[PDB]
UniProtKB/Swiss-Prot annotation, chain C:
Region of interest (Disordered), residue spans: 52-77
Bias (Acidic residues) ranges: 61-76
Full-protein positions shown: 1 to 176 of 594
Family: Belongs to the herpesviridae CVC1 protein family.
Protein name (Swiss-Prot/TrEMBL): Capsid vertex component 1
Cellular compartment(s): Virion; Host nucleus
Function, in words: Capsid vertex-specific component that plays a role during viral DNA encapsidation, assuring correct genome cleavage and presumably stabilizing capsids that contain full-length viral genomes.
Quaternary structure (record): Interacts (via C-terminus) with capsid vertex component 2/CVC2.
Cystine bridges: none
Highest taxon of source: Viruses
From Swiss-Prot, chain D:
Record's protein name: Small capsomere-interacting protein
Organism (species): Human cytomegalovirus (strain AD169) (HHV-5)
GO cellular component: host cell nucleus; viral capsid
Residues of the full protein shown: 13 to 75 of 75
Segments passing through the bilayer: none
Locations listed in the record: Virion; Host nucleus
Quaternary state and interactors: Interacts with the major capsid protein/MCP.
Keyword Flavoprotein: no
Gene Ontology BP, a term: viral process
Swiss-Prot record, chain E:
Oligomeric and partner information: Heterodimerizes with CVC1. Interacts with major capsid protein/MCP and triplex capsid protein 1/TRX1 at the pentamer vertices. Interacts with the large tegument protein/LTP.
Family statement: Belongs to the herpesviridae CVC2 protein family.
Coiled coil: none
Region called Interaction with major capsid protein/MCP, residue ranges: 1-37
Gene expressing this chain: CVC2
The protein, known as: Capsid vertex component 2
Lineage top rank: taxon: Viruses
Organism expressing this protein natively: Human cytomegalovirus (strain AD169)
Role of this protein: Capsid vertex-specific component that plays a role during viral DNA encapsidation, assuring correct genome cleavage and presumably stabilizing capsids that contain full-length viral genomes. Participates in the interaction between the capsid and the tegument through interaction with the large tegument protein/LTP.
Curated annotation (Swiss-Prot), chain F:
Role, per record: Self-assembles to form an icosahedral capsid with a T=16 symmetry, about 200 nm in diameter, and consisting of 150 hexons and 12 pentons (total of 162 capsomers). Hexons form the edges and faces of the capsid and are each composed of six MCP molecules. In contrast, one penton is found at each of the 12 vertices. Eleven of the pentons are MCP pentamers, while the last vertex is occupied by the portal complex.
Complex formation: Homomultimer. Makes the hexons and eleven out of twelve pentons. Interacts with triplex proteins 1/TRX1 and 2/TRX2; adjacent capsomers are linked together in groups of three by triplexes, heterotrimeric complexes composed of one molecule of TRX1 and two molecules of TRX2. Interacts with scaffold protein; this interaction allows efficient MCP transport to the host nucleus. Interacts with capsid vertex component 2/CVC2. Interacts with the small capsomere-interacting protein/SCP.
Parent-record interval covered: 589 to 1028 of 1370
Source organism of the structure: Human cytomegalovirus (strain AD169)
Top-level taxonomic group: Viruses
Subcellular location: Virion; Host nucleus
Name the record gives this protein: Major capsid protein
Family membership noted in the UniProt record: Belongs to the herpesviridae major capsid protein family.
């Protein structure tokens, strides 16, 4: 589950979303997306 | 004096008007029958033996499957390579990530996305659009030229100092086609065009809109993206830039079937076209109902 | 309606070599849009036998029957296969009527006489008149034969449909 | 034997109480011939029950 | 302030065995089931 | 002057104690004349009781029932004042169709269509009423879709009432074949139906109505499949015995609303039972595709108008309470998508509205499902919903909605400028 | 569609507001002001964009 990383230390972010991509999302949002997709997928001899 | 064929054609007239649908019942058209057609005078025989119709239907089934068998080949290749590397996949597209994220839920979302993509993929998927230019006639010669350029030996000082320019390499920015699948509200966008370039600081891929804006769906957790390159390399990318990489094999299909299904059309000279090749076309010769006809 | 007459004469002239008989069609808003009808460039048709083999290819098969090879340098038998595939399509004449009309009334406005079993009127926003050839080499024609219709627009895009001879000819051949 | 088919379609499909039977209900007796020939849809008992109801209703109407 | 690990070539994501077996069983189901779309169209 | 009748209409359609038995009668009759004639005695008692004991005119929610009551129950089966209320409703519809057209200039025809159809969409046959009971006689250029493709005549099947039709009852949940009542709607009644549903109903209710379908297969099985109705003779022992005989659902639905001193509960339920043989099928939503007329087709000749309609359903103003289990809410139109009714009938919609309280409003801002949510291709768009949300419940509001339906084509322009409008 | 209607609301996500709906909440006088974002679409009286 845990990812391996090349850089030993993390760095702060000083750029807007229109120039570099960053994966950021709260845990609650992740759980909500998971359950919503779970119901959606099923919703779709 | 004699009578013209046009006069007897007009006077004889028609007596039939029938609607005919295509095999898949998508389109309906009408057929006219003229009682003065030379079709009448022939000694024609007709029969519809059942075995011939059964074989024809089997061949028609084979014709349809050509796209879906290719999609299934991509899917089972994805599963095969995922099993091969034990589920460990490396980052290949530039994105910043955090160790605190719960990656189990995004794995689950990736599974849902795989199911949804397999449910929605169609003839207009990125695979077909990516392979179609390969069928063009210039393609083979261009590939031979590209290989011969790619592996030529390093120039000696003489040719650098004297004579022609250095042979230019391939451009740094490529054109790819992609299929974008979003889970939170089921939505799959097939055959989207994208521009791909490799970042200088780190050798990862960066994808941009054809207008130049950065495509941002690496940052969105609910979307996975499938990319296909003109070299028929495909990446299945889940958010964070971690991807599954393999090649789109198509040796499971005969040349004839693929070719006659979707070889590209090439035009023939007609009104309004320059006789020389590659010239700038004038206005399209429209025929319209808004205006009086030119005569 | 001149297109149908010309095509009938042309197919009569070519029948000895081609063994193709003429088939006259009318297209309207049920098969193509108004813009597509206004901008149409070419119409092409292809004959396919009961075994799924196109007319223009060799009877005993081709090199194309071999599987593809995934090699970019080979493309897919590139130039020779492209030439073989293009060879199987055939071009047909067509004319576009870009304004709404009633088909039977239009035919009677021309010199034709019309006498149908049922005289129901059919109204269409526009009409495309074209003639396709159906192949009958043995002087026999099998109901399992399939015919393809292709429409091509200036940007090179195309749309394909296919029809089998039973639906085209069931009662018409039984009547003759 | 039509007896076994009639008993099955009366006691399993229609689930009718024992108080009502073929002898006591002429409408049911007339309907049994039609229902027996349709051996499928027996998992969809509601269709047969509703059809019996509407046949009784049309029986009671003043026409 | 939020902090992140910047991209590289040698940073990888690992699948836990439960998810991997779920994916593999889905693959077997899809392989054997044979719900092919051309069959649906011809049907 | 129809102010009193319209006031009573306003108070009845907005009342929260509207009896849900009326919805059941509506779906059973579904505009069938023969079904109504059999049920007539039941309707008279129901109307008189529901008007006397509750100050509201009943069965007002349905166009078909209103017209049938107006024309068939005028023989003397009702007190004159209630009959006159229904007659005033139909007269209001006639007044609206009088204003909608231009009678002084609508002579002649152009390209096979009446000149009135070019002026106001209320007379154009391409526009459908939101709730459809019969198919229209005129379909010269319109397609209707049940599952994926337009319905051919082969896909349309005729219902057979009064005879055994169990294969149709099996297909109740299917979608590909459409079952019709063998009647076809004339142009005039088509226009009147459109007036009733597009002009009168939203003006009086302010977008607080909704459409629902009943699982009437299971509902009728659970309701009438009793020895009392099966052994119906060609026993009125006591009130409690009748209660036990008819069941809890029927005794709750019918007792105080349709019974009378001269008609106990059991025979009232028997009267209701006789309508079962028409039944119909389950609710379904249809899509209507129609290019505009030959004048509006000059620009954008490839535009196809998309339009969604409800079949085998009914328009409701309150959420049914006894029939909750058998009821399905169908928000399908900006005039009929009331979030309150849907939240009462469906738990998922209740959770959705709880999460997003701002969606609770009634100005057409409530999100329709993606299938129905085609704003630009619809005939009526946001201004209509806003105006109906704010408009007062007066006769003028109906006629304003009718006049907003005047068409834009050049033919409509020359017509209405020549009238100096 | 009727059965699938609950499934749409099953997911608690809000939907974007259409541009035509956004036009309706400007008053008669400030429709013409620079604050009216939607003006770039109001090109023809008889057509929507």
């Amino acid at each position: 589950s845990l990812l391996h990383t090349f850089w030993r230390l993390p760095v702060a972010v000083f750029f807007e979303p229109h120039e570099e991509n960053v994966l950021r999302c709260p845990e609650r949002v992740l759980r909500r997306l998971l359950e919503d997709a779970a119901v959606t997928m099923r919703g779709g001899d | 004096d004699e009578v013209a064929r046009t006069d007897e054609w007009k006077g004889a007239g028609v007596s039939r008007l029938r609607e005919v649908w295509d095999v898949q019942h998508r389109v309906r058209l009408r057929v006219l029958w003229y009682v003065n057609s030379f079709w009448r005078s022939r000694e024609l025989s007709y029969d519809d033996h059942e075995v011939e119709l059964y074989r024809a239907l089997d061949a028609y089934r084979a014709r349809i499957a050509v796209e879906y068998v290719l999609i299934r080949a991509v899917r089972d290749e994805i599963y095969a390579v995922l099993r091969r590397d034990g589920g460990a996949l490396p980052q290949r597209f530039a994105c910043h990530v955090s160790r605190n994220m719960s990656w189990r839920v995004v794995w689950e979302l990736c599974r849902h996305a795989l199911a949804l993509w397999m449910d929605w993929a169609d003839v207009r998927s990125c695979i077909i659009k990516a392979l179609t230019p390969r069928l063009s006639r210039g393609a083979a010669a261009a590939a031979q030229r590209a290989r011969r350029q790619r592996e030529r030996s390093a120039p000696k000082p003489q040719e650098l100092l004297f004579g022609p320019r250095n042979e230019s390499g391939p451009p740094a920015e490529q054109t790819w086609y992609a299929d974008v699948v979003r889970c939170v509200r089921a939505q799959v966008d097939l055959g989207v065009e994208v521009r791909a370039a490799r970042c200088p600081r780190t050798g990862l891929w960066i994808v941009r809109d054809r207008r130049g804006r950065l495509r941002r769906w690496l940052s969105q957790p609910e979307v996975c993206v499938l990319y296909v390159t003109p070299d028929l390399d495909f990446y299945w990318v889940l958010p964070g830039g971690f991807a599954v990489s393999s090649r789109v094999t198509l040796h499971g299909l005969a040349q004839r079937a693929l070719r006659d299904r979707f070889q590209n059309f090439e035009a023939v000279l007609a009104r309004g076209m320059h006789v020389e090749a590659g010239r700038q076309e004038p206005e399209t010769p429209r025929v319209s109902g808004r205006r009086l006809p030119f005569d | 309606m001149e297109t149908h007459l010309y095509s009938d004469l042309a197919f009569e002239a070519r029948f000895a070599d081609d063994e193709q008989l003429p088939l006259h069609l009318v297209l309207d808003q049920e098969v193509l849009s108004n813009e597509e009808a206004e901008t149409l460039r070419y119409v092409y048709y292809r004959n396919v036998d009961s075994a799924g083999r196109s007319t223009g290819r060799a009877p005993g098969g081709d090199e194309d029957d071999a599987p593809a090879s995934d090699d970019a340098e080979d493309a897919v038998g590139g130039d020779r296969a492209f030439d073989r595939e293009r060879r199987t399509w055939q071009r047909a004449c067509f004319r576009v009527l870009p304004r709404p009309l009633e088909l039977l009334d239009y035919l009677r406005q021309s010199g034709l006489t019309v006498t149908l079993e049922k005289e129901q009127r059919v109204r269409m926003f526009y009409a495309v008149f074209t003639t396709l050839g159906l192949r009958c080499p043995d002087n026999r024609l099998s109901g399992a034969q399939t015919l393809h219709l292709r429409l091509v627009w200036p940007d090179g895009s195309y749309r394909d449909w296919e029809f089998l001879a039973r639906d085209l000819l069931r009662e018409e051949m039984e009547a003759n | 034997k039509r007896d076994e088919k009639h008993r099955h379609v009366v006691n399993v499909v229609l689930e009718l109480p024992t108080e009502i039977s073929e002898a006591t209900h002429p409408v049911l007796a007339t309907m049994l011939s039609k229902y027996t020939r349709m051996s499928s849809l027996f998992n969809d008992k509601c269709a047969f029950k509703l059809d019996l109801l509407r046949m009784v209703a049309v029986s009671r109407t003043r026409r | 302030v939020a902090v992140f690990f910047e991209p590289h070539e040698e940073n990888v994501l690992r699948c836990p065995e439960r998810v991997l077996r779920r994916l593999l069983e889905d693959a077997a189901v899809t392989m054997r089931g044979g719900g092919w779309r051309e069959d649906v169209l011809m049907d | 002057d129809y102010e009193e009748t319209l006031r009573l209409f306003k108070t009845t359609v907005t009342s929260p104690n509207y009896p849900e038995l009326c919805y059941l009668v509506d779906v059973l009759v579904h505009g069938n004349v023969d079904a109504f004639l059999l049920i007539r005695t039941f309707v008279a008692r129901c109307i008189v009781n529901m008007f006397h004991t509750r100050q509201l005119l009943v069965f007002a929610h349905s166009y078909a029932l209103v017209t049938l009551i107006a024309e068939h129950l005028a023989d003397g089966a009702l007190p004159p004042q209630l009959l006159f209320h229904y007659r005033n409703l139909v007269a209001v519809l006639r007044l609206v169709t009088r204003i909608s057209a231009l009678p002084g200039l609508n002579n002649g025809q152009l390209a096979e269509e009446p000149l009135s159809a070019y002026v106001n969409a209320l007379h154009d046959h391409r526009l459908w009423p939101p709730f459809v009971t019969h198919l229209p006689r005129n379909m010269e250029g319109v397609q209707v879709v049940a599952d994926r493709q337009p319905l051919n005549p082969a896909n349309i099947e005729a219902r057979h009432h009064g005879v055994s039709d169990v294969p149709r009852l099996g297909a109740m949940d299917a979608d590909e074949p459409l079952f019709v009542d063998d009647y076809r709607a004339t142009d005039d009644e088509w226009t009147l139906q459109k007036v009733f549903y597009l002009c009168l109903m939203p003006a009086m209710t302010n977008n607080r109505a909704c459409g629902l379908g009943l699982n009437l297969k299971t509902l009728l099985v659970d309701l009438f499949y009793r020895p009392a109705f099966l052994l119906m003779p060609a026993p009125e022992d006591s009130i409690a015995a009748q209660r036990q005989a008819v069941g809890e659902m029927l005794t709750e639905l019918v007792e105080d609303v349709a019974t009378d001193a001269h008609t106990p509960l059991l025979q009232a339920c028997r009267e209701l039972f006789l309508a079962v043989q028409f039944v119909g099928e389950h609710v379904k939503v249809l899509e209507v595709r129609a290019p505009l007329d030959h004048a509006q087709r000059q620009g954008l000749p490839d535009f196809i108008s998309r339009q969604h309609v409800l079949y085998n359903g009914c328009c409701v103003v309150t959420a049914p309470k006894t029939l909750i289990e058998y009821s399905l809410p169908v928000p399908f139109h900006r005039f009929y998508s009331n979030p309150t009714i849907c939240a009462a009938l469906s738990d998922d919609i209740k959770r959705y509205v709880t999460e997003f309280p701002h969606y609770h409003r009634h100005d057409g801002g409530f999100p329709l499902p993606t299938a129905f949510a085609h704003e630009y291709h619809n005939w009526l768009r946001s201004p209509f919903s806003r105006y109906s949300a704010t408009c007062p419940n007066v006769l003028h509001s109906v006629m304003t909605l009718a006049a907003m339906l005047y068409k834009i084509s050049p033919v409509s322009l020359v017509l209405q400028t020549k009238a100096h409008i | 569609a009727a059965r699938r209607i609950p499934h749409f609301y099953r997911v608690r996500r809000e939907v974007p507001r259409t541009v035509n709906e956004m036009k309706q909440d400007f008053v008669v006088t400030d429709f013409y002001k620079v604050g009216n974002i939607t003006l770039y679409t109001e090109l023809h009286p008889f057509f929507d964009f």
